[PDB]
Amino acid sequence: MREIVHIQGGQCGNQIGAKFWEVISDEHGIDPTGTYHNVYYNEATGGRYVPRAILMDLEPGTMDSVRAGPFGQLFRPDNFVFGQTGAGNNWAKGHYTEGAELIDSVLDVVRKEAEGCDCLQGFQITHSLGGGTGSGMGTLLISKVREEYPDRIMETFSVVPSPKVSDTVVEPYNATLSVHQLVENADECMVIDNEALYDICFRTLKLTTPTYGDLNHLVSAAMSGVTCCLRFPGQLNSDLRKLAVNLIPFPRLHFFMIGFAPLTSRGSQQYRALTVPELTQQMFDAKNMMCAADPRHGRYLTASALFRGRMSTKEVDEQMLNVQNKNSSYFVEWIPNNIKSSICDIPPKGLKMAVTFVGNSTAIQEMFKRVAEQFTAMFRRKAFLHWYTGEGMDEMEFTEAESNMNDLVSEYQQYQDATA
């Protein structure tokens, strides 16, 4: 009942998916064999539990990267859709010519995984935003399945370009090309930056060797805490749609932010207690979010706080009311009590409390503005355009894409100023 088909894609998608299935298997008390010791797994002969996830890419090396790692033997080999040609870090390659004439097999797999369910609820994708195969195949699959299954919902945990210094040089192009496919065909899209994760892992946990494994672990923990209020009992249970309705006021302001709590170092853990005022004090902090956009530069159109464990709901409600009435400026007004709460009844594996924070803020628009600069400064000189043109891409689309992005940021700029 209310199942989830987790699709991944690209390098970031595959790695985050590996760590995410590791964390999930840890939660439900499973070992890498796949035996216990419906929302995520599927039963198989002999009491085995196989994840309901398809893994796709154009480069068969990332398979041997994820498969050989621990908690790897779970994913059924009938799902590794790995084209044996290459990706190349280019959008039109993985969306029109090369990573497009393969999508039929991916649709076949998605259909065999969907029609075999009873009441499918929503798709949950994890992918990069500028990676060629990742972003390209992600947006193409989005278009296809959303034109195909409108009854269900869509959710994408994307990773934005590292704001300060980039990781690829053609990232603005593909980021804009993906954004123009998201706001037209999605229903829930959270954004994460590889930059604020560094500042967190270095100034919140006092780490010295932060490996991409640990950052992916943090992101995956956040992703699990998001939907943990669905597969578990709770004094007030939420889902993937109660958010989709209590958050987005208009069909496009659907770009959220993610925050996990609590995250503590060694000494800082020795000195602080686990009491929900402390978790709240850590939750709203700008240095505690997975999106490199200081919310202080904006407001929150809405913010849902999904707790876990066991606590008096009066404490939660008092903390919400105090943080809302006290920071009366950082919240917009024409939506009264713009903060939503929810309480599940299962703590993490080895804590007493837990908080996931999903926030539709009007502050991330700035990030988009940043991209709206770079792309614009990479188009009047037609820089790198001929590679994308070499796959039949009509430059016209690029234009409207940027235009689309304009409206998007313009939308937010119309609301953080709105008064009533």
Binding site: Q269, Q270, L274, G350, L351, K352
Partner: protein, 53 residues
């Protein structure tokens, strides 16, 4: 009709008996509440020890 038992003659007995019963129940409830509170505190201490380990 010279006398009507509908009047309460032994009101003092009713009052004192109700007082004693109420004190008894109050004592029982106080004890069980202190027990519950101490058990909650010890469970919190257990979580403290788990986290420290």
């Amino acid at each position: 009709l010279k006398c009507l038992d509908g009047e309460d003659l032994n009101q003092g007995n009713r009052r004192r008996l109700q007082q004693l019963q109420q004190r008894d129940w109050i004592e029982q409830q106080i004890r069980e509440k202190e027990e519950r509170k101490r058990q909650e505190d010890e469970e919190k201490k257990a979580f403290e020890q788990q986290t420290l380990h």
